[PDB]
Amino acid sequence: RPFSDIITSIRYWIIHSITIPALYVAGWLFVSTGLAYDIFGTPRPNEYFTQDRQQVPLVNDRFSAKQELEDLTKG
Amino acid sequence: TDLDENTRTVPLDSSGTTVILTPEQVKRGKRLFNSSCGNCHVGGITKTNPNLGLEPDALSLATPARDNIDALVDYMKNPTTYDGLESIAELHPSVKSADIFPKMRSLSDEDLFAIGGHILLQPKLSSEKWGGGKIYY
Amino acid sequence: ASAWERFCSWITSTDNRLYIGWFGVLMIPTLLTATTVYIIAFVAAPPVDIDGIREPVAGSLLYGNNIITGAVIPSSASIGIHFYPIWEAASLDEWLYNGGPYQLIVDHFLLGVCGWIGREWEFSYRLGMRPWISVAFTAPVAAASAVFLVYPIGQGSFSDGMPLGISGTFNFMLVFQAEHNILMHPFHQLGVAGVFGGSLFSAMHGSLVTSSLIRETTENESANYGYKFGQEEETYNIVAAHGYFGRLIFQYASFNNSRALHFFLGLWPVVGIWFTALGVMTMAFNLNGFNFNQSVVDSQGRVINTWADILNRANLGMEVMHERNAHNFPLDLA
Amino acid sequence: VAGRDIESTGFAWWSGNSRLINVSGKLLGAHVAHAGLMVFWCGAMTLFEVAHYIPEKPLYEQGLILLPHLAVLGWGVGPGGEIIDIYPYFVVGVLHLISSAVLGFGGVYHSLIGPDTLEESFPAFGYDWRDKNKITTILGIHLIVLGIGAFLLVIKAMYVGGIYDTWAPGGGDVRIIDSPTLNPGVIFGYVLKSPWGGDGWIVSVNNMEDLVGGHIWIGIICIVGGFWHIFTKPFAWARRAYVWSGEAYLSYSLVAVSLMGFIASQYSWYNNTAYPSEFYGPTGPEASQSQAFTFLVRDQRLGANVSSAQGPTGLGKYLMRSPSGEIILGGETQRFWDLRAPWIEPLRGPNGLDLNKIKNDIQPWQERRAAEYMTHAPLGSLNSVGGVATEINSVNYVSPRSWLTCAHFFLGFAFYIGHLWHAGRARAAAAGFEKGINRENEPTLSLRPID
Amino acid sequence: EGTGEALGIDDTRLIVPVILIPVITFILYAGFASEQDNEDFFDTYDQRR
Amino acid sequence: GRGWFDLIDDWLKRDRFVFVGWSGLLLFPTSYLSIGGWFTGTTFVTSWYTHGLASSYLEGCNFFTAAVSTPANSMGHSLLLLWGPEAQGDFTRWCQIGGLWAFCALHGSFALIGFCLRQFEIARLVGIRPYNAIAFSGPIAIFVSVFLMYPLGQASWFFAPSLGVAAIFRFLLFIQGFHNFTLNPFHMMGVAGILGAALLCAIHGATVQNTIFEDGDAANTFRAFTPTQAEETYSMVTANRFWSQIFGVAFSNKRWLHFFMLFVPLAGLWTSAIGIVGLALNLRAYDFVSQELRAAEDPEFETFYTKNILLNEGIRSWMAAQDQPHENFIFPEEVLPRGNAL
Ligand code: CLA
Ligand code: CLA
Ligand code: CLA
Ligand code: CLA
Ligand code: CLA
Ligand code: CLA
Ligand SMILES: CC1=CCCC(C)(C)[C@H]1/C=C/C(C)=C/C=C/C(C)=C/C=C/C=C(C)/C=C/C=C(C)/C=C/C1=C(C)CCCC1(C)C
Ligand SMILES: CC1=CCCC(C)(C)[C@H]1/C=C/C(C)=C/C=C/C(C)=C/C=C/C=C(C)/C=C/C=C(C)/C=C/C1=C(C)CCCC1(C)C
Ligand SMILES: CC1=CCCC(C)(C)[C@H]1/C=C/C(C)=C/C=C/C(C)=C/C=C/C=C(C)/C=C/C=C(C)/C=C\C1=C(C)CCCC1(C)C
Ligand code: OEX
Ligand SMILES: [Cl-]
Ligand SMILES: [Fe+2]
């Protein structure tokens, strides 16, 4: 049925007064929990550098990349 | 790394005593530096006289040495040439010359302390950016 | 039945091969003068001291340039934006030393394109058709005035206008990026959207009109001959193209109305080029593109680079290397 | 719905105001409501500037654009362009904001409940776009009003407090302009001057006597012209040379106002008399010449003979000769040798910058001004990062001159585009082919083929 | 250049063309104008030439 | 219709809101996996371990500075499969070595393939000529030449265009500084095609909107068109007269006009693709040897070309240290090419 016919329907809004904010808040707790930094490996504001690692970290080998990544990301 | 106390400890006096700046102090110092002197001293340089920057090498080799909070704070009220023989209060922003430099009028002793803390804290953050100029932007 | 009336009828005549009109009265002499001086200066002209430091730059073919490197060099920085006609020079040789031909060509050409705008309106009026094709042409003229006139005015020197050459155009680009960061300036981004979208919509519209051409041609004959000039019927099925494009993306996106379609075609590139011309006009007065340099710092407060910083490195290289002998002081305020 | 839909008017909602062309009272309400919008913004914005104004920084460093106008008119500013009081700014703001209520009520009244057309209930105010005499009378009344405004500026400069002269003896100060220049050869000498470098046309006002005297001239001109148009009708040469419709009048106003926008943009960019550098900040030429002056003073202080110092290319590193021979500051400031500011004229002789004054008698305040104007050049980004494009994010600053110049150049170009649109449409609609080409009588098919 | 002469007229000779050529053009235009029906009209433009 | 293949074909080609088609089995997954991947990489994934940069909204970047940066240079031209010998199935390390760029690019290539196949399929089923699928070949050529063949000619995927805004600006200036790509005649032909296509779009829109026939009595003339009318809505003869007597030449044939509108941008894109393919192998129109020799022997010979060469040297030297961190370029201030003052 046509788009405007759905949007003005009350049932649409009984569904989406609850469904949309739920995931809008789910993203909030996804990042506020710090879970994104762990899934995607992104350094936090206090993880770009560390002791003996005041320089930029770079992977310099194709095949041992995981190995040096743990070595650099031991933290 | 966090803004630990190792970064926030800066020399206080000429003998060698240190002082640990608080996060409020460094925040206020950064804001005051950017508002009162950023126009000429953005990046630890001197736009009007690039021969004399704010990098720790220049401050240490100044007469008197300006690599400490008390010396910097005294410079902000009794500025002098690089050899400390002529007063340049009429050509430099100073709290004693705030009528002709209307940005120094509102600064208190704690504001001068925070500004000096910001100056001495900067070189700790980067190895060459503070006073390095374009080459390290 | 008066000589002035006959002259006005001839000028405003729709029987001349090329319409003159009253705007053409100003356009044709100005454009012809600009063309003549440009051709003469491009084939043969002495080097020009563009930067006002007695370091002439060659731009003419006879002085060791090709079509790619040739240019009519901008005026000397010593002149500034002072008016520099031939009669204000002690001699014609020193008129050519300080790049007077650039001033002549630019002034005559800007007046000529203004006359072209007006003449487009005029011959729209003589044929009884709607105006505003001229409004479409204002966008290129806006950009040309922005680069040739407004940028010298803001920066204060005709040396800063774009050179009338190909390599000089690239030089002006690189210096503009170094000094203003035009790429990060959102009006130039709107212009990039304008030209890319103009190409996209041109390709799309041509593809859909050519794709739904009504069969009016044999197999041993070009399809273009299926259309006869001045015919009354449409040469292609608007319904077929509209339905194909609706199935391609979704029905609502397609322009079922042809007049709205062509208004959008005329609107997107014209507005984009208006915006980028205005962006150059505003960076003439040093309202630069965005400066996100050192915008990300860690908890300690040390700068973590971004792509803005790496772009800044290229801008800084261009800044330091441009006009190596012209600057005596650290800031590039001029 | 009648007169407010496409069916009964032929105009869509997005050309909605085009449905006001022949509705005189509703159009009057539109104009009055929009004037209410203008005065509302003036009051609200200057109150915002007063609220955000800190007494430490100067006006130009705080992003303030409106309070400089009042300071130039001579309110709440002392010697040296130091803003001592900001209560008159508050008074102006509240007056504009309160007057906006009255103008908004009038506009909403005439738009919604007032008579649609004034031509039957108020024939004095009603009009037809094609009735040349009545439209000229309206134009003349407005010209008299503009002349009254010019004379209001004259009264302010001459009697009520006076205006801020940045060229005043000593430092710049608020002073009474007792002797404006009323010589036609000066006032209209400015109007016929060239716009190119060194001339500047009317942007090159270097004193307030010329400004006030030429405002007297503008007031006299406008009042005389208004009385001329009230008691006259357009002549035959004019009656055949114009399209006498509302859209044509709109296009004429649009082109005039676009020209004014360009001129005002360059006024804010180049002039430093009606736009003193102590309120609007340095001009670009001022900042560049200030950089050259600062480094001249520095190197002279360090033992260099600035007059005899040779730059990389053989030209003067600090001092050289302009193309006309005047001794001028060197480097890339050579293009800006036409700068004249109250802080640099003191060192200027008949033949340029006097070398004796430049060597022995540069005062400390000149060095301070040069440093301030160097560090506060008009350069900056859209997000307000002061300095060159390749600078770092520590200084938050764009000069008010850059904002005003860019905004008014933008609006001038936009209003030229609007003029082109509306003038073309006026011509097409008067001739009667603004809706399309008549399929019955197409002019092109009647024309003989070319080639 | 940069002297401030009105319309660039530094020599008085320059005025002779600047004033006369419009006057000859004005004289030629007057022959056209005098032939027109110069009474008023109530229209957006004059259709009478 | 009876057979299983016939049933699948019937369902895939159903006339619904979103046409699926057989090509949809290649387009919709990969395209989706591309776009969300970008939205993932530009939102959470970093370039700290590949470029030394922050490139996500999480790290603090905005829409301009956020990007899906290319892989590390040490990766070479690895396919960067999540199960490959580099990540070895670890999602976090995969994102950290910039394998998400490989994901986005390799899925985008097949998304472009699927969309061109979609254009062909819908053109066939609707029953029109397939000129729109051939015009998308231009964009396909741009993507293939710039994102696949260029890094495959260079040392690694690292030098591909990083998927962003500021990243693309950095790619533009990098290619200019290192290849002098503005001097490349194929780039010149491409920008000619692009600007000429924008010109054709603008002139055609204005001309059609301004030679419309009076098909109504409303000042707003959009409503005076019917989709199914068998009458041209604007005068080709009047437009031809206008442009012939204004510009000397003018289109007289609509079909030629609309093929030209197709040909100009497509030709531009293919020409510029030839130039970028040249740049993949460092076969660059960098210099005019005659002028280089003359300037070497004549220190007073200066052209705008030589100024551009100096600018390119500046770009290279001042950009290499931070743009190629894997090389560990330490250029002292002594060796950096500079000018007087600034
Ligand atoms: C400066 C802005 C401006 C102004 C002054 C006007 C004014 C006008 N427009 Mg509008 N218009 C504008 C912008 C503006 N327009 C824009 C941007 C668009 C594009 C969407 C339109 C589209 C448009 C259309 C399509 C039409 C008009 C029409 C009109 C006129 C009649 C209004 C009417 O009866 O509506 C009735 C409206 C209402 C009953 C809604 C309530 C509006 C209230 C009064 C606004 C509240 C204002 C303020 C808070 C009150 C302060 C009170 C004071 C005492 C303090 C009126 C003169 C009509 C016209 O031409 O008629 C002949 C018409 O058809 N306009
Ligand atoms: C562009 C401005 C404008 C114009 C042209 C008109 C025109 C009109 N209005 Mg008015 N009107 C306006 C603004 C305007 N209005 C505003 C701003 C408001 C809101 C306050 C109103 C509110 C309004 C109402 C409520 C009504 C009208 C009506 C009318 C009509 C009759 C006017 C009349 O009888 O005057 C008579 C004039 C006067 C009474 C004014 C006398 C002067 C006083 C004492 C002020 C003196 C000021 C002084 C000289 C200024 C010194 C300047 C110094 C600071 C330099 C007429 C069509 C009437 C109408 O259409 O009825 C259907 C009507 O009822 N108008
Ligand atoms: C808002 C202002 C305004 C407007 C809209 C009009 C409108 C009109 N006036 Mg004018 N007029 C005005 C103010 C105005 N007047 C004033 C203040 C005076 C002085 C008393 C006059 C004196 C006047 C007279 C004596 C006559 C008109 C007439 C006319 C009509 C013809 C205009 C024309 O063709 O000009 C043509 C303009 C020119 C040929 C050029 C103008 C010359 C100046 C000096 C140019 C100088 C160069 C300039 C500085 C260059 C740069 C400008 C830059 C902004 C682009 C028209 C109805 C005529 C009419 O029919 O009256 C009944 C007529 O004879 N007006
Ligand atoms: C978004 C809309 C917008 C905004 C917010 C502004 C804002 C501004 N414009 Mg404007 N402007 C706009 C659109 C806008 N403009 C457009 C579209 C154009 C056309 C292109 C212009 C063209 C324009 C010009 C030409 C100029 C401005 C200027 C200005 C500034 C001053 C306003 C002023 O006082 O005007 C003038 C105000 C009036 C005409 C109202 C009447 C004033 C009376 C008569 C003054 C009485 C004074 C007297 C001393 C009082 C005391 C009397 C007694 C006690 C003695 C201000 C920043 C000025 C500026 O600084 O430019 C750089 C300027 O010169 N604007
Ligand atoms: C003095 C100022 C002035 C006045 C009184 C009018 C009056 C009118 N214009 Mg407008 N116009 C102006 C300035 C003015 N114009 C300028 C400066 C331009 C050039 C940009 C135009 C361009 C224009 C067009 C193209 C058209 C009109 C039309 C009209 C009529 C209806 C407009 C309407 O209802 O809009 C209602 C308002 C809206 C729908 C809101 C739109 C807001 C836009 C989208 C925001 C701005 C976008 C973008 C930043 C602009 C870039 C411009 C570029 C040149 C830089 C009405 C007679 C229309 C008409 O029917 O004429 C008879 C018409 O077709 N005008
Ligand atoms: C339209 C569908 C489609 C397409 C064309 C692709 C294409 C691609 N994906 Mg995949 N992908 C898809 C859907 C799709 N994907 C979906 C829905 C998901 C989400 C679950 C993913 C998730 C995903 C990830 C996480 C990754 C890819 C990657 C890839 C690339 C590597 C493919 C590869 O080598 O896989 C392996 C080969 C195949 C899958 C083909 C199978 C062929 C037959 C059916 C096997 C038969 C078995 C045989 C009999 C076994 C006998 C044993 C032995 C002797 C042979 C390639 C661009 C990689 C990439 O982009 O790296 C940068 C990558 O890491 N994709
Ligand atoms: C007294 C004081 C002391 C300290 C500071 C403080 C600010 C608080 C100050 C108080 C000031 C006060 C209360 C000021 C009051 C001002 C008021 C109420 C101003 C209102 C002005 C009204 C205006 C513009 C109306 C204009 C309306 C227009 C065009 C409407 C447009 C429209 C119309 C007409 C028809 C179609 C719809 C559309 C387009 C919306
Ligand atoms: C990535 C990856 C790795 C391995 C396997 C796996 C299948 C998971 C694979 C694929 C993952 C996929 C496809 C994930 C899906 C993620 C997607 C689709 C993310 C997209 C998110 C969209 C976003 C933010 C949109 C934001 C939009 C904005 C602001 C719009 C701005 C606007 C607003 C807010 C108001 C008006 C103006 C304007 C400009 C329109
Ligand atoms: C007020 C002030 C402040 C600072 C000091 C200063 C001395 C400058 C002082 C004085 C300023 C003065 C006196 C300014 C006066 C400005 C003047 C008189 C400007 C003149 C503007 C005139 C213009 C555009 C005329 C253009 C008219 C045109 C096309 C008319 C129409 C037409 C004609 C003529 C022929 C072709 C067809 C068409 C288009 C119908
Ligand atoms: O000349 Mn052309 O250019 Ca615009 O900046 Mn300053 O001066 Mn030079 O420098 Mn960078
Ligand atoms: Cl310099
Ligand atoms: Fe078409």
Side-chain angles (χ1 to χ4, degrees), chain C residues 16 131 211 234 247 259 307, chain F residues 15 129 170 209-210 245 254-255:
Chain C
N16 303 351
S211 167
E234 200 85 60
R247 274 82 180 255
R259 291 179 172 199
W307 286 118
Chain F
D15 201 354
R129 314 202 294 174
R170 62 180 295 275
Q209 265 292 344
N210 296 8
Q245 284 199 247
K254 290 174 65 174
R255 306 185 156 193

PDB file of all heavy atoms in Angstrom, chain C residues 16 131 211 234 247 259 307, chain F residues 15 129 170 209-210 245 254-255:
ATOM      1  N   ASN C  16      20.314  38.238 -40.012  1.00  0.00           N
ATOM      2  CA  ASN C  16      21.757  38.052 -40.029  1.00  0.00           C
ATOM      3  C   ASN C  16      22.093  36.618 -39.643  1.00  0.00           C
ATOM      4  O   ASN C  16      21.410  35.997 -38.826  1.00  0.00           O
ATOM      5  CB  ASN C  16      22.433  39.029 -39.067  1.00  0.00           C
ATOM      6  CG  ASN C  16      22.097  40.474 -39.372  1.00  0.00           C
ATOM      7  OD1 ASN C  16      21.486  40.777 -40.396  1.00  0.00           O
ATOM      8  ND2 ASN C  16      22.485  41.373 -38.477  1.00  0.00           N
ATOM      9  N   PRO C 131      12.848  33.427 -21.325  1.00  0.00           N
ATOM     10  CA  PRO C 131      14.229  33.850 -21.094  1.00  0.00           C
ATOM     11  C   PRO C 131      14.930  32.816 -20.246  1.00  0.00           C
ATOM     12  O   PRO C 131      14.444  31.696 -20.240  1.00  0.00           O
ATOM     13  CB  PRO C 131      14.043  35.124 -20.306  1.00  0.00           C
ATOM     14  CG  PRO C 131      12.837  34.857 -19.476  1.00  0.00           C
ATOM     15  CD  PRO C 131      11.948  33.948 -20.275  1.00  0.00           C
ATOM     16  N   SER C 211      17.777   4.948 -25.817  1.00  0.00           N
ATOM     17  CA  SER C 211      17.390   3.559 -25.621  1.00  0.00           C
ATOM     18  C   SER C 211      15.953   3.293 -26.045  1.00  0.00           C
ATOM     19  O   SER C 211      15.637   2.175 -26.462  1.00  0.00           O
ATOM     20  CB  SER C 211      17.578   3.171 -24.155  1.00  0.00           C
ATOM     21  OG  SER C 211      16.944   1.938 -23.870  1.00  0.00           O
ATOM     22  N   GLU C 234       6.802  13.026 -31.010  1.00  0.00           N
ATOM     23  CA  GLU C 234       7.971  12.696 -30.213  1.00  0.00           C
ATOM     24  C   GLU C 234       8.779  11.594 -30.889  1.00  0.00           C
ATOM     25  O   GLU C 234       8.230  10.666 -31.490  1.00  0.00           O
ATOM     26  CB  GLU C 234       7.560  12.253 -28.811  1.00  0.00           C
ATOM     27  CG  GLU C 234       8.671  12.356 -27.779  1.00  0.00           C
ATOM     28  CD  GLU C 234       8.782  13.739 -27.177  1.00  0.00           C
ATOM     29  OE1 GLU C 234       7.800  14.201 -26.561  1.00  0.00           O
ATOM     30  OE2 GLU C 234       9.854  14.365 -27.321  1.00  0.00           O
ATOM     31  N   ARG C 247      11.768   0.766 -12.729  1.00  0.00           N
ATOM     32  CA  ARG C 247      12.172  -0.582 -12.343  1.00  0.00           C
ATOM     33  C   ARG C 247      13.636  -0.629 -11.924  1.00  0.00           C
ATOM     34  O   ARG C 247      14.016  -1.477 -11.110  1.00  0.00           O
ATOM     35  CB  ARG C 247      11.923  -1.567 -13.488  1.00  0.00           C
ATOM     36  CG  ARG C 247      10.514  -2.157 -13.531  1.00  0.00           C
ATOM     37  CD  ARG C 247       9.536  -1.211 -14.194  1.00  0.00           C
ATOM     38  NE  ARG C 247       8.178  -1.750 -14.258  1.00  0.00           N
ATOM     39  CZ  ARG C 247       7.573  -2.240 -15.337  1.00  0.00           C
ATOM     40  NH1 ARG C 247       8.171  -2.295 -16.518  1.00  0.00           N
ATOM     41  NH2 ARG C 247       6.327  -2.687 -15.230  1.00  0.00           N
ATOM     42  N   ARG C 259       9.109  18.175 -18.479  1.00  0.00           N
ATOM     43  CA  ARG C 259       9.502  19.550 -18.204  1.00  0.00           C
ATOM     44  C   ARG C 259      10.224  19.660 -16.868  1.00  0.00           C
ATOM     45  O   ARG C 259      11.229  20.369 -16.756  1.00  0.00           O
ATOM     46  CB  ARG C 259       8.273  20.454 -18.241  1.00  0.00           C
ATOM     47  CG  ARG C 259       7.701  20.605 -19.637  1.00  0.00           C
ATOM     48  CD  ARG C 259       6.464  21.476 -19.663  1.00  0.00           C
ATOM     49  NE  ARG C 259       6.048  21.759 -21.032  1.00  0.00           N
ATOM     50  CZ  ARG C 259       5.243  22.748 -21.396  1.00  0.00           C
ATOM     51  NH1 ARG C 259       4.717  23.582 -20.513  1.00  0.00           N
ATOM     52  NH2 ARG C 259       4.952  22.902 -22.684  1.00  0.00           N
ATOM     53  N   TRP C 307      43.149  12.137   7.966  1.00  0.00           N
ATOM     54  CA  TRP C 307      43.367  12.429   6.555  1.00  0.00           C
ATOM     55  C   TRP C 307      43.471  13.928   6.307  1.00  0.00           C
ATOM     56  O   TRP C 307      44.121  14.352   5.346  1.00  0.00           O
ATOM     57  CB  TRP C 307      42.248  11.819   5.718  1.00  0.00           C
ATOM     58  CG  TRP C 307      42.357  10.334   5.594  1.00  0.00           C
ATOM     59  CD1 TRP C 307      41.461   9.407   6.031  1.00  0.00           C
ATOM     60  CD2 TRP C 307      43.436   9.602   5.004  1.00  0.00           C
ATOM     61  NE1 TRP C 307      41.910   8.142   5.744  1.00  0.00           N
ATOM     62  CE2 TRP C 307      43.122   8.235   5.115  1.00  0.00           C
ATOM     63  CE3 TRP C 307      44.636   9.970   4.394  1.00  0.00           C
ATOM     64  CZ2 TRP C 307      43.961   7.241   4.635  1.00  0.00           C
ATOM     65  CZ3 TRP C 307      45.467   8.980   3.925  1.00  0.00           C
ATOM     66  CH2 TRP C 307      45.127   7.634   4.041  1.00  0.00           C
TER      67      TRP C 307
ATOM     68  N   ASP F  15       6.998  -8.308 -11.277  1.00  0.00           N
ATOM     69  CA  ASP F  15       6.872  -6.852 -11.293  1.00  0.00           C
ATOM     70  C   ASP F  15       6.365  -6.405  -9.927  1.00  0.00           C
ATOM     71  O   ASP F  15       5.158  -6.383  -9.674  1.00  0.00           O
ATOM     72  CB  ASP F  15       5.943  -6.409 -12.419  1.00  0.00           C
ATOM     73  CG  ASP F  15       6.147  -4.955 -12.815  1.00  0.00           C
ATOM     74  OD1 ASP F  15       6.922  -4.245 -12.142  1.00  0.00           O
ATOM     75  OD2 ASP F  15       5.522  -4.519 -13.803  1.00  0.00           O
ATOM     76  N   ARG F 129      16.433  -0.597 -25.930  1.00  0.00           N
ATOM     77  CA  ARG F 129      17.820  -0.837 -26.279  1.00  0.00           C
ATOM     78  C   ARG F 129      18.710  -0.628 -25.055  1.00  0.00           C
ATOM     79  O   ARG F 129      18.397   0.178 -24.178  1.00  0.00           O
ATOM     80  CB  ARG F 129      18.243   0.083 -27.420  1.00  0.00           C
ATOM     81  CG  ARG F 129      17.229   0.144 -28.557  1.00  0.00           C
ATOM     82  CD  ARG F 129      17.849   0.604 -29.860  1.00  0.00           C
ATOM     83  NE  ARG F 129      18.299   1.988 -29.804  1.00  0.00           N
ATOM     84  CZ  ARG F 129      18.984   2.598 -30.762  1.00  0.00           C
ATOM     85  NH1 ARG F 129      19.304   1.983 -31.890  1.00  0.00           N
ATOM     86  NH2 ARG F 129      19.363   3.859 -30.584  1.00  0.00           N
ATOM     87  N   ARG F 170      43.336  13.548  -0.313  1.00  0.00           N
ATOM     88  CA  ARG F 170      44.732  13.194  -0.165  1.00  0.00           C
ATOM     89  C   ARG F 170      45.177  12.375  -1.364  1.00  0.00           C
ATOM     90  O   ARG F 170      46.309  12.504  -1.801  1.00  0.00           O
ATOM     91  CB  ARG F 170      44.953  12.442   1.144  1.00  0.00           C
ATOM     92  CG  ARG F 170      44.222  11.120   1.285  1.00  0.00           C
ATOM     93  CD  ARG F 170      44.517  10.467   2.620  1.00  0.00           C
ATOM     94  NE  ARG F 170      45.924  10.094   2.726  1.00  0.00           N
ATOM     95  CZ  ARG F 170      46.457   8.965   2.272  1.00  0.00           C
ATOM     96  NH1 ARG F 170      45.715   8.050   1.670  1.00  0.00           N
ATOM     97  NH2 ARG F 170      47.756   8.752   2.428  1.00  0.00           N
ATOM     98  N   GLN F 209      13.576  23.819 -21.358  1.00  0.00           N
ATOM     99  CA  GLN F 209      12.650  24.555 -20.510  1.00  0.00           C
ATOM    100  C   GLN F 209      12.276  25.914 -21.079  1.00  0.00           C
ATOM    101  O   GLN F 209      11.252  26.469 -20.663  1.00  0.00           O
ATOM    102  CB  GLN F 209      13.239  24.753 -19.111  1.00  0.00           C
ATOM    103  CG  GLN F 209      12.806  23.717 -18.092  1.00  0.00           C
ATOM    104  CD  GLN F 209      11.340  23.826 -17.734  1.00  0.00           C
ATOM    105  OE1 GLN F 209      10.698  24.838 -18.002  1.00  0.00           O
ATOM    106  NE2 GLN F 209      10.803  22.783 -17.122  1.00  0.00           N
ATOM    107  N   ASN F 210      13.064  26.457 -22.009  1.00  0.00           N
ATOM    108  CA  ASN F 210      12.851  27.804 -22.517  1.00  0.00           C
ATOM    109  C   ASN F 210      12.340  27.855 -23.946  1.00  0.00           C
ATOM    110  O   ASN F 210      12.095  28.953 -24.455  1.00  0.00           O
ATOM    111  CB  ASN F 210      14.144  28.609 -22.404  1.00  0.00           C
ATOM    112  CG  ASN F 210      14.556  28.801 -20.975  1.00  0.00           C
ATOM    113  OD1 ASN F 210      13.973  28.210 -20.071  1.00  0.00           O
ATOM    114  ND2 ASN F 210      15.547  29.632 -20.753  1.00  0.00           N
ATOM    115  N   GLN F 245      21.945  31.125 -34.542  1.00  0.00           N
ATOM    116  CA  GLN F 245      22.241  32.541 -34.701  1.00  0.00           C
ATOM    117  C   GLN F 245      22.935  33.155 -33.493  1.00  0.00           C
ATOM    118  O   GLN F 245      23.376  34.306 -33.582  1.00  0.00           O
ATOM    119  CB  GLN F 245      20.954  33.305 -34.997  1.00  0.00           C
ATOM    120  CG  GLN F 245      20.443  33.133 -36.414  1.00  0.00           C
ATOM    121  CD  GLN F 245      19.467  34.215 -36.821  1.00  0.00           C
ATOM    122  OE1 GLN F 245      18.284  33.951 -37.029  1.00  0.00           O
ATOM    123  NE2 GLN F 245      19.960  35.440 -36.946  1.00  0.00           N
ATOM    124  N   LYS F 254      17.219  15.436 -32.568  1.00  0.00           N
ATOM    125  CA  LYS F 254      17.125  15.085 -31.155  1.00  0.00           C
ATOM    126  C   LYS F 254      17.928  13.830 -30.843  1.00  0.00           C
ATOM    127  O   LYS F 254      18.577  13.742 -29.793  1.00  0.00           O
ATOM    128  CB  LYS F 254      15.663  14.884 -30.762  1.00  0.00           C
ATOM    129  CG  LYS F 254      14.845  16.162 -30.749  1.00  0.00           C
ATOM    130  CD  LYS F 254      13.363  15.914 -30.501  1.00  0.00           C
ATOM    131  CE  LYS F 254      13.098  15.348 -29.121  1.00  0.00           C
ATOM    132  NZ  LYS F 254      11.643  15.245 -28.828  1.00  0.00           N
ATOM    133  N   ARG F 255      17.879  12.842 -31.735  1.00  0.00           N
ATOM    134  CA  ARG F 255      18.568  11.582 -31.487  1.00  0.00           C
ATOM    135  C   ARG F 255      20.074  11.793 -31.422  1.00  0.00           C
ATOM    136  O   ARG F 255      20.754  11.236 -30.551  1.00  0.00           O
ATOM    137  CB  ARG F 255      18.197  10.578 -32.579  1.00  0.00           C
ATOM    138  CG  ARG F 255      16.688  10.384 -32.734  1.00  0.00           C
ATOM    139  CD  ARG F 255      16.327   9.297 -33.725  1.00  0.00           C
ATOM    140  NE  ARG F 255      14.999   8.755 -33.453  1.00  0.00           N
ATOM    141  CZ  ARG F 255      14.505   7.647 -33.988  1.00  0.00           C
ATOM    142  NH1 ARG F 255      15.213   6.895 -34.814  1.00  0.00           N
ATOM    143  NH2 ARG F 255      13.263   7.280 -33.682  1.00  0.00           N
TER     144      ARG F 255
END
